[PDB]
Design a protein around this ligand. Structure first.
Ligand code: CL
Ligand code: CL
Lengths: 150, 150, 150, 150, 150, 150
C-alpha cells in the first residue's frame, strides 16, 4: 500500500505534466471539427485532477487509490484520443482520407486494450473465487482432520 | 510532516517548472478577451511561489506545508482555467461553438473538483466521527473496567 | 520480475512521455504520403500503452512483465521509424535522394537489430543448452554414484 | 548542513535548467519597451549562476551556502518579473490595459511576497531571541541550583 | 562494473531521451545539403538503440556494458555533428560565412576531444599495464625469497 | 571522489542535456552577427563533452572529474552567452540599444562571479596554508613531547 503509493505517484506526475504541456503546445496550432477542444480540455481536467491527488497525499479507506487509478486511466485515454484528432486536423486542408484511416486502424487497438483489460479484471475476480474455493476446501479437510484428534 | 516533507516536496518542483515554461509557450500564439493574460500571469506567479517553497524548507509551524498544498491547488486550478481560456480565445474568432462547449464542460469540471473535494472532506468527518466516537466510548469502558476492581 | 518491475517501470515513464509529446510537436508541422500521421499515432499510442502499464501494476499474472517489454520495444522501434518518416517528408519536395537514402539506411539498422537480436537469442540458446547439458550430466554421474551406496 | 545538502541541492538543478531553457524559447516571440531584454537576460544570468553553484558543491560552509540561497531567491523574483514583462510585450499593439491590469493583479502579489517574507523573517529571528533567552535563564538557574550544593 | 550498470542506466536515459526528442524539434525548423536529415535520424537510431539497451536489463554477455559505453559515445558525437549542421542550414540562405567559420573553430575541437579521449585510452592501457608489472615483479621477488625455504 | 561520483554526477547531466536541446531551439531563429551560431554550437560541444565524461565511468583517471567540473561550468557560461546573443537579435531589426545595456550589465556580473570566486578561492588557499600552520605547531609540540621525553 505504501511503496506503490509513493513510487507510482512519483513517476505518474511526470507523465501528467508532459501530457499537460505537450497537449498544451498541441492546442495553439492553426499553421471532428468543434468537439476537439472539448476532448482535449476534458483531458486537461482528468490529468490536472489526478495530479491534484498527487498533491493531496501527505497524510495518505482504499477508495482513494482506485480514484487515482481511474483518473490516470482516463488521462491516458483522452491523451491518445485527442492526439489521434491531431493527426486528424493536421491532414484536413491537404487530405481528408488519411485521418479517417488513422482512427480506423488505431481505435480498433483501443477496443483491443479494453478487451484484454476486462479479460484480466475477470481473471483477478475469478482466481479470487478459485483461491477462496480451494482454500475453503482445505479448511474443511482441516476441520475433519482436527475432529479426529479430539 | 517530515517524511511527507521529503516525499511530496521532492516531486512538486517538476510540476511547477513544466507548467511555468509550457505556460510560456502557451502565451505566445496569435499567428474572456482581455483578462486571459492576467489569469496566466498570476498563475505562473503562484507556481513561482511554490518553487520558492521548494527551496525554502531546508533546515526545518506546519501550516507552511498547507501553504504549499493549497497554493499548488491554485496552481493546477489556474492552469486548467487558463487553458480553458486558451481553447476560448484561440478558437473564438475562428469558431464559437468549440470554445463555448469547452467552457460548458470545464465549468462542469471545476464543479467536479469542488464537489468531490467537499465530498471527501465530509467523508473525513464521517469515519473520523465513527472511529473517534467508538474511541471515546472504549476509553469509558476502560474506566469502568478499572473501577470494577476497586 | 519484482525489483526489475519497479526500476524499469520507474524509468520507462520518462521515455514514453518525452517521445510521446515530442512526436506531438512533430505532428503539427508542415512547414509515405497519407499514412504518416497514422504511423505516428500508433507510435505515441504504444508509448501511451507502456505508460498505462506503468500505472497498471497496482493489483499486479506474469506475462504482463514481458508485455511491458514489448510495449517499450515497439516504442523506440516505431519512434525511430516515424522520425525516419519525418526525414522522409522534410526532404521530399526539396530532394528525392536524401529521404530515400534516409529510410534505406535506417531499415538497415532495423536489420542490424533483428540480426543481433536473433544472434543473442541463439546465445541464450547456447547458455541454455550448455547449462542444461552439464546439469543433466552431473546429475547422471551423481545418480549412478549415488545408486552405488543404495 | 549535510542532510540539507542532500535535500535542497538534489532538486535545485532540474528547476534551474528548465526555467533557463523555456525562458530561452520565451525570447523568440513577436507573433516597458527596451528594459525587457535586460530583465529577462539578467534573470537567465542569475539562474545560470545558481546552476554553477548547484554543480560546485563537490567537496561537501553556511557563508557560501547562504550566498547560493539569496542567489536562488533573487533568481525566482527575476523570473516572475520578466515573465510579467513577457505577457506585457507579447500583447502591446493589441491592448495596453490587459497587460496593465495584469500588473495591477501581480504587484499586489509582489508586496504579498515581501510582506509575508519579512513577517516570518522578523518573527523567526524573534523566536531565536526567545530560545536564546530561555537558554540563558535556565543555565543561570542551574548555576544557582549548583550553589545549593555548596 | 555493476554500480555503473544500475546508476548510469538510471540517469543516462533521461538525457538520451531529451536529446532524441529535442533532435526531433531540431528537424522542423527552417522558419552538406541532403544527408543531414539522415544523419540526425540515424543519431536518434543510436540513442533509441541505447535506450533499447536501457530496457534490456531486466535480468541484467558482460560486454553489453561496453556496448552501452560506445553506443553512448557515438550518440553524443553524432548529436554535436548534426547540431553543427543545424547552425549551418538555418543560416544558409541568409548567411554563408557564420556557420562555415563555426565549423572552422569547432571541428578542430572534434579532433581535440577524440584526440584527448584516445590520449587517455593510451594512459589507461599504460597504467593498467604498470599495475600488472608491479604485481608480476613483486611476485618474482617474493617468489625467490619464499623459494629459498622450499 | 566517491560521494561526488554519486552526488554531483547523478544530477548535473540532466541540466546539461536540457541546455543542449534548448540551445538547439535557440539556433533556429531569423526573426554580434556571424559568431552567434559559432557560440551556440561551441556551447553544444562543451555540454556534449560533460555528458561523455558522465558516461565514462563504466570501468571506474580522476583528473577527468576536474575536466567534468570545469566542463559543466563552461557549459553554463556558453549557454548564457548565446542566449544573450539571441536577446540581441530579437532586439536587432526593431531596436539596438536595449540588448546593449543588457549585455553591459551582464558581463559586469560575470566578472563579479569570477572576481569573488577567485577571491575566496584564495581564501581557500589561505585556510589550507593556515591549517598547515596550526598543524605544524601541534606537530612541533608533538616533536618535543616525542623525542624530548626519550
Ligand atoms: Cl527524479
Ligand atoms: Cl532519485
Amino acid at each position: 500500500k505504501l511503496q506503490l503509493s509513493r513510487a507510482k505517484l512519483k513517476a505518474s506526475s511526470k507523465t501528467s505534466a508532459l501530457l499537460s504541456g505537450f497537449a498544451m503546445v498541441a492546442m495553439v496550432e492553426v499553421q471532428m471539427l468543434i468537439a476537439f477542444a472539448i476532448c482535449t480540455t476534458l483531458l486537461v481536467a482528468v490529468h490536472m485532477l489526478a495530479l491534484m491527488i498527487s498533491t493531496c497525499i501527505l497524510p495518505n479507506h482504499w477508495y482513494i487509490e482506485t480514484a487515482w487509478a481511474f483518473s490516470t486511466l482516463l488521462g491516458l485515454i483522452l491523451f491518445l484520443l485527442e492526439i489521434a484528432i491531431l493527426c486528424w486536423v493536421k491532414f484536413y486542408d491537404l487530405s481528408p482520407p488519411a485521418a479517417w484511416s488513422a482512427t480506423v486502424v488505431l481505435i480498433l487497438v483501443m477496443i483491443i486494450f479494453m478487451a484484454f483489460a476486462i479479460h484480466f479484471y475477470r481473471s483477478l475476480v475469478s482466481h479470487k473465487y478459485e483461491v477462496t474455493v480451494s482454500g475453503i476446501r482445505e479448511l474443511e479437510m482441516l476441520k475433519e482432520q482436527m475432529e479426529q484428534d479430539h
